[PDB]
Amino acid sequence: KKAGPVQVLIVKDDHSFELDETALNRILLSEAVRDKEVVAVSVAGAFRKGKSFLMDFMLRYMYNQESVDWVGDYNEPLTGFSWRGGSERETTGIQIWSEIFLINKPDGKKVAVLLMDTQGTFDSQSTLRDSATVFALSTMISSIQVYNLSQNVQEDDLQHLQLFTEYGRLAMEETFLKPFQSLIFLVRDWSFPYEFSYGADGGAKFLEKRLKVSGNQHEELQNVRKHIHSCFTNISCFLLPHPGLKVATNPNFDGKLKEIDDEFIKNLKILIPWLLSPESLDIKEINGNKITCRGLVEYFKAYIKIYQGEELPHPKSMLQATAEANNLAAVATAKDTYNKKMEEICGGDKPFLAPNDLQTKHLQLKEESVKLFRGVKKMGGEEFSRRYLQQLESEIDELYIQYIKHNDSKNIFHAAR
Amino acid sequence: KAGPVQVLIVKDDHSFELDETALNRILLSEAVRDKEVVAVSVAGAFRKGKSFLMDFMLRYMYNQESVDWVGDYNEPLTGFSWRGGSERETTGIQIWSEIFLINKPDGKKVAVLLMDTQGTFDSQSTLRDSATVFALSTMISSIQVYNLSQNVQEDDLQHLQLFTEYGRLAMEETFLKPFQSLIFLVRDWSFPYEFSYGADGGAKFLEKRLKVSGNQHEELQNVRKHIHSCFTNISCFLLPHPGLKVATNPNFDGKLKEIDDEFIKNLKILIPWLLSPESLDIKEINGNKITCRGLVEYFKAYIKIYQGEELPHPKSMLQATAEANNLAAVATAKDTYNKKMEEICGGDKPFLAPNDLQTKHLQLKEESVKLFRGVKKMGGEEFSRRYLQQLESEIDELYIQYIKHNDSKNIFHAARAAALEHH
Numbered sequence: 160k161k162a163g164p165v166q167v168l169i170v171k172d173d174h175s176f177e178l179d180e181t182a183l184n185r186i187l188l189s190e191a192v193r194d195k196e197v198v199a200v201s202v203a204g205a206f207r208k209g210k211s212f213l214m215d216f217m218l219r220y221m222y223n224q225e226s227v228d229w230v231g232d233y234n235e236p237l238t239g240f241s242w243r244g245g246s247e248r249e250t251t252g253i254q255i256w257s258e259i260f261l262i263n264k265p266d267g268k269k270v271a272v273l274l275m276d277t278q279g280t281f282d283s284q285s286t287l288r289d290s291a292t293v294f295a296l297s298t299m300i301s302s303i304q305v306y307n308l309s310q311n312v313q314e315d316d317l318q319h320l321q322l323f324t325e326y327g328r329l330a331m332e333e334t335f336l337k338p339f340q341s342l343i344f345l346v347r348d349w350s351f352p353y354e355f356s357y358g359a360d361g362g363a364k365f366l367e368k369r370l371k372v373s374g375n376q377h378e379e380l381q382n383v384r385k386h387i388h389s390c391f392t393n394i395s396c397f398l399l400p401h402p403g404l405k406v407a408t409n410p411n412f413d414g415k416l417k418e419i420d421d422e423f424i425k426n427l428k429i430l431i432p433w434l435l436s437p438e439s440l441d442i443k444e445i446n447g448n449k450i451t452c453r454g455l456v457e458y459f460k461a462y463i464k465i466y467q468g469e470e471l472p473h474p475k476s477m478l479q480a481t482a483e484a485n486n487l488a489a490v491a492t493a494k495d496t497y498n499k500k501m502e503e504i505c506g507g508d509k510p511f512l513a514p515n516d517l518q519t520k521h522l523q524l525k526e527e528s529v530k531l532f533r534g535v536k537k538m539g540g541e542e543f544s545r546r547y548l549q550q551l552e553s554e555i556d557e558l559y560i561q562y563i564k565h566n567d568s569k570n571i572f573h574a575a576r
Numbered sequence: 577k578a579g580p581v582q583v584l585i586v587k588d589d590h591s592f593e594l595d596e597t598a599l600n601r602i603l604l605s606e607a608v609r610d611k612e613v614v615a616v617s618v619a620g621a622f623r624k625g626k627s628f629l630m631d632f633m634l635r636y637m638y639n640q641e642s643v644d645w646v647g648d649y650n651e652p653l654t655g656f657s658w659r660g661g662s663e664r665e666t667t668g669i670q671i672w673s674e675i676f677l678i679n680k681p682d683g684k685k686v687a688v689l690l691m692d693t694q695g696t697f698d699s700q701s702t703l704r705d706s707a708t709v710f711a712l713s714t715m716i717s718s719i720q721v722y723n724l725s726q727n728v729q730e731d732d733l734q735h736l737q738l739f740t741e742y743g744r745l746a747m748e749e750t751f752l753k754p755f756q757s758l759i760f761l762v763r764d765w766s767f768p769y770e771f772s773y774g775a776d777g778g779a780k781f782l783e784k785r786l787k788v789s790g791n792q793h794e795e796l797q798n799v800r801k802h803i804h805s806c807f808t809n810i811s812c813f814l815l816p817h818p819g820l821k822v823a824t825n826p827n828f829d830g831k832l833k834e835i836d837d838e839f840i841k842n843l844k845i846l847i848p849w850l851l852s853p854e855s856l857d858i859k860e861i862n863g864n865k866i867t868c869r870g871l872v873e874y875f876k877a878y879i880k881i882y883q884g885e886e887l888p889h890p891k892s893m894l895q896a897t898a899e900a901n902n903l904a905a906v907a908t909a910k911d912t913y914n915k916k917m918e919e920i921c922g923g924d925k926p927f928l929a930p931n932d933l934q935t936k937h938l939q940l941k942e943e944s945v946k947l948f949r950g951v952k953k954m955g956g957e958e959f960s961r962r963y964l965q966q967l968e969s970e971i972d973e974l975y976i977q978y979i980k981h982n983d984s985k986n987i988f989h990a991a992r993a994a995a996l997e998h999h
């Protein structure tokens with residue numbers, strides 16, 4: 160009866176994902192909201208950075224919109240989505256709030272507002288596929304994604320965003336429009352207001368310089384930025400002050416405003432409506448169509464269904480992915496070398512060779528391809544490269560069988576006359 | 577006067593060069609030439625307090641015989657350049673001009689080198705820029721302080737694996753571990769009620785964070801196993817937040833009077849812990865202890881490798897995955913063409929009229945192209961366009977060879993036809 164967080168996407172110990180359809184259906188398919196267009200707000204990013212903490216202040220705003228003091232009473236504990244200190248991850252999978260909010264757009268549109276809290280990336284229990292799936296899904300479902308970052312916007316942040324969004328793209332319909340809508344770079348604990356002011360305007364100037372594409376820029380840097388711009392219709396940045404050392408280090412801290420830095424609260428009171436004001440709420444769109452709560456449930460099911468199978472390629476650790484590419488490239492190089500040299504010997508316009516001599520040449524050329532494959536430095540491991548070396552040897556054996564038949568025909572076809 | 581010396585330069589065109597004259601001036605002096613060397617380096621993400629830390633290491637190295645080495649509380653912090661702001665400061669690799677001569681417990685007189693490095697992941701650097709600095713600083717130092725913020729996350733572990741693997745590949749083959757001491761320094765640790773500030777809380781924390789289990793997922797296991805196999809001594813120190821003045825006040829100067837006391841307390845444990853003569857390990861490479869002169873030779877050799885050898889250069893996660901996806905698809909699509917052409921014009925198959933053979937090839941080539949296009953790949957058709965072009969070009973080359981094999985089955989086809997046509 161009382162409102163609370165609802166586990167909607169479950170991530171199990173075996174790294175499998177399961178959707179709680181009953182709960183999702185309960186919330187988004189009720190008669191009161193099912194036919195309404197939907198605004199979905201999500202927060203995502205690294206674990207332990209205050210994502211759920213933030214969402215709970217968004218809840219205070221949603222519940223007390225017409226009040227000037229929505230931020231709460233100063234002795235009131237912060238509740239909603241579960242948050243706490245400690246070095247271990249808290250939120251898992253994807254949670255939504257059980258109460259859908261009905262908000263009047265300035266035109267008169269009665270839209271429904273969904274709030275989505277997510278499992279943090281880069282925890283020690285999770286595989287990269289786990290983190291990417293949760294990040295992609297929230298981005299594919301939300302119309303406003305708050306990318307929660309610590310201290311700065313680093314190049315590895317941009318490359319992770321790129322990886323995660325591209326993974327989302329893969330499971331989506333082909334489209335001629337931008338795949339996603341609003342992205343907010345929220346920088347927590349910004350330490351340089353004297354370089355860029357706290358808030359949206361300092362954020363805007365900061366992010367502008369961060370994502371700017373220039374002709375002098377190395378292609379690797381250009382491309383990640385181009386990808387990001389291509390993915391989102393609106394991109395903004397908000398620079399938030401540190402909430403104070405007590406918020407971060409006191410195990411008894413409760414979310415009470417009286418224990419939070421004043422300049423934080425001041426910028427917080429600007430941040431939330433800036434994200435969530437009736438003016439700012441963009442209705443979810445997928446490939447050119449405004450999605451209702453009913454439609455969102457459908458896409459949520461279809462998307463997770465794709466991530467549950469093996470139709471998509473999955474993201475892998477940095478060393479593992481480079482390693483595969485290293486080996487796949489080496490296998491192709493070694494095989495093409497063997498092949499080119501065999502054609503010089505038993506191509507169609509070359510004379511028939513005695514079988515034993517063909518075999519002797521094959522064995523020499525094969526061994527040279529094996530040596531070539533082995534001499535290329537690859538990440539990561541001669542033991543990672545075993546499966547690929549073995550594939551190379553067997554694929555070359557298969558090619559040689561074709562070459563025997565080709566060689567034999569030069570003798571056979573002539574005998575038949 | 578002593579000051580920081582720029583030794584490794586990263587050019588604005590992303591190539592690498594060593595300032596050999598600067599290096600020789602320092603490490604080839606008659607005083608230190610043949611001294612066994614200890615090299616202390618700090619590496620990690622930009623703007624995290626690396627240079628700042630090293631300047632406190634400088635104070636210790638200069639005032640060991642003093643009661644209070646940490647300094648007067650009203651004295652500014654100098655040495656390696658540091659500042660606030662969100663833009664990176666340190667570039668390439670710099671070292672301190674003064675080599676410190678210290679006596680080890682066993683009575684050796686070793687030379688001590690301090691090395692400050694360019695922070696990783698700035699927006700000016702390619703991944704290869706960041707990887708090369710990190711790797712070299714690891715390959716040169718006997719003690720690598722890995723400087724992190726707030727936590728040891730999984731992306732930090734994967735970056736360390738990526739960077740150390742890149743270093744390892746440019747090293748002489750060995751059966752021993754490639755490196756020596758690694759310290760996970762966690763800046764702004766927020767949970768002393770869970771793991772204490774300092775080396776003991778850090779030890780217990782990192783023990784759980786890096787523990788290998790044969791039951792956890794392969795990729796979690798393998799990053800951990802890689803890190804353990806790379807270093808002979810791995811440690812962890814949890815440092816408190818220095819206070820908001822240090823992090824946020826533009827007028828902050830490094831004066832201890834403006835730094836949180838808890839940080840100072842732990843800083844005064846950290847530095848002697850890192851730099852105590854008992855624990856200062858002498859640089860070894862491939863089982864041999866290295867002198868100062870010998871360190872320079874290795875620096876030049878290592879640098880040369882990154883300049884001119886075939887190495888698997890680090891790529892962004894998307895880039896790497898996308899290449900693998902495309903390479904596999906090309907291979908598969910190409911193999912499908914080959915197999916099906918062999919059913920049509922393999923050596924044990926009859927001659928085909930050049931026009932029949934042409935239309936089979938055109939049919940099968942299109943089937944392979946569509947096979948290639950049908951497979952889901954990171955990331956995009958644009959990324960794949962060059963690979964699709966490569967596939968089509970390679971299939972065209974196979975077709976040319978198939979034409980030659982087919983002709984050899986009936987060389988006289990055209991000539992006999994022209995003769996029978998006249999008759």
Ligand SMILES: Nc1nc2c(ncn2[C@@H]2O[C@H](COP(=O)(O)OP(=O)(O)NP(=O)(O)O)[C@@H](O)[C@H]2O)c(=O)[nH]1
Nearest residue numbers: 206207208209210211212242243244248249250279
């Ligand atoms: N330094 C800092 N700490 C913050 C900030 N906001 C909240 N915290 C603290 O961060 C800790 C984690 O809060 P939480 O909201 O649970 O973070 P989370 O991102 O949801 N974690 P998880 O990924 O594990 O779900 C709490 O101790 C909270 O007080 C902030 O802006 N800066």
Ligand SMILES: Nc1nc2c(ncn2[C@@H]2O[C@H](COP(=O)(O)OP(=O)(O)NP(=O)(O)O)[C@@H](O)[C@H]2O)c(=O)[nH]1
Nearest residue numbers: 622623624625626627628658659660664665666695
């Ligand atoms: N939050 C926090 N800030 C710190 C800490 N130590 C130093 N700082 C602040 O960090 C800022 C950057 O210092 P600096 O030593 O230049 O960092 P760096 O890692 O060398 N930067 P770069 O990689 O760009 O050379 C300074 O404003 C300094 O006051 C710390 O432990 N925590």
Ligand SMILES: [Mg+2]
Nearest residue numbers: 210211249250
């Ligand atoms: Mg959370």
Ligand SMILES: [Mg+2]
Nearest residue numbers: 626627665666
């Ligand atoms: Mg620096």
